[PDB]
From TrEMBL, chain B:
It comes from the Bacteria. It comes from Legionella pneumophila subsp. pneumophila. Residues 17-242 form the SidE PDE domain. This is Septation initiation protein.
């Protein structure tokens, strides 16, 4: 499915994912597309933070869902 | 918008001993996996998150819990002091005082305490066990320094007091004291730099209001949104990525439209664009107290703010 990844400033991408896809898996995907290292990404959905072991289906994340990325500095 | 030189001298020592120093609870031994929860020294996520960034091949350690975050809260506690005084009936804490009752001396003591609030971090780890351990370290770092150099300013009752605030004990109220209330409310504003609009405007549960609703409920919509725009100007001044705001997007963030409409009746409409992080401003803020302080004093406080 598609899910939206927005920085707090508002720069947005989509990803093609599957609901049982770990956040570590999706952080690896966000690096493949954008060059942002996993541990420079703090991910948030429905006002909770997202965890590396858990799945999208453990947060109820469905098609065209917006997650929120906290990025301090591009290239930092 | 002016801080006592004895406050900045305490922030000089803190930056050298704690905020400059790397994150030491990190690496493989502090990784976490729920599935194997006690296969590591970590009992929860977050130990390896944003440990440093690189500006001109220089490390900016604990960037999100660093010098710019720590010193921005002092300006917020100095603004809310006047904001509280404008209220007929400011919130009255468990000790029986309001922030408005605080004198100019207590605020200088409260500013010195705010410096060690997150200074005891060893990582971005956020689970209560890491959070309460790190707050305990910052508290003991305060106690030692305060007992040794600041007896001319603090009484032994006040070190006990301010250490208890920084600790944020399990079984102490939010506003248990008018100093700790304000220290929390200062810490809180600055969360705007790392939180989704939900936790900022909707609140992260049905109970909890949301950061800006808190500023509006306590200080009024006018004073309450002045305080928010100033927090976001101070983000800009310290090279932080200023978030955008959009009341049109709140319905599509996976919440029940009760808590959106509640936030919409309270916040009102807010549309306002975000601004992108600057390596140069961030580094100026992050690597010296002089550069942090200088970058932040330049920024206009609202029209009603007149320091005593």
């Amino acid at each position: 499915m598609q899910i939206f990844v927005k920085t707090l400033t508002g720069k947005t991408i989509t990803l093609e994912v599957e609901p049982s896809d770990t956040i570590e898996n999706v952080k690896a995907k966000i690096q493949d597309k954008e060059g942002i290292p996993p541990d420079q990404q703090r991910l948030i959905f429905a006002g909770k933070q997202l965890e590396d072991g858990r799945t999208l289906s453990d947060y109820n994340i469905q098609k065209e869902s917006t997650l929120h990325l906290v990025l301090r500095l591009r290239g930092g | 918008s002016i801080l006592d030189p004895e406050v900045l001298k305490v922030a000089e020592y803190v930056y050298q001993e704690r905020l400059s120093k790397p994150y030491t609870e990190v690496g493989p031994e502090w990784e976490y996996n729920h599935k194997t929860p006690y296969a590591t020294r970590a009992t929860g996520t977050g130990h390896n998150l944003q440990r440093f960034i690189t500006i001109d091949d220089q490390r900016l350690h604990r960037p999100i819990a660093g010098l710019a975050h720590t010193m921005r809260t002092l300006f917020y506690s100095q603004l809310m002091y006047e904001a509280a005084k404008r209220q007929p009936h400011p919130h009255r804490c468990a000790d029986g005082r309001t922030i408005a009752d605080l004198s100019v001396q207590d605020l200088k003591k409260l500013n010195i305490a705010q410096l060690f609030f997150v200074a005891g971090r060893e990582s971005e780890a956020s689970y209560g066990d890491a959070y309460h351990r790190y707050h305990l370290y910052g508290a003991k770092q305060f106690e030692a320094y305060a007992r040794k150099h600041l007896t001319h300013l603090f009484s032994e009752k006040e070190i006990v007091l301010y250490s208890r605030c920084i600790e944020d004990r399990i079984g102490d109220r939010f506003d248990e004291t008018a100093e700790g209330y304000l220290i929390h409310l200062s810490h809180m504003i600055d969360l705007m730099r790392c939180k989704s609009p939900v936790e900022v405007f909707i609140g992260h549960s049905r109970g909890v209001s949301g950061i800006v609703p808190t500023l509006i409920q306590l200080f009024g919509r006018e004073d309450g949104l002045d305080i928010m725009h100033y927090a976001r100007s101070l983000f800009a001044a310290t090279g932080e990525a200023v978030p955008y705001i959009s009341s049109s997007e709140w319905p599509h963030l996976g919440i029940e439209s009760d808590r959106v409409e509640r936030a919409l009746k309270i916040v009102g409409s807010l549309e306002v664009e975000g601004q992108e992080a600057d390596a140069k401003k961030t580094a100026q803020a992050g690597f010296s107290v002089d550069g942090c302080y200088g970058a932040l004093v330049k920024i206009d406080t609202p029209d009603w703010y007149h320091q005593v």
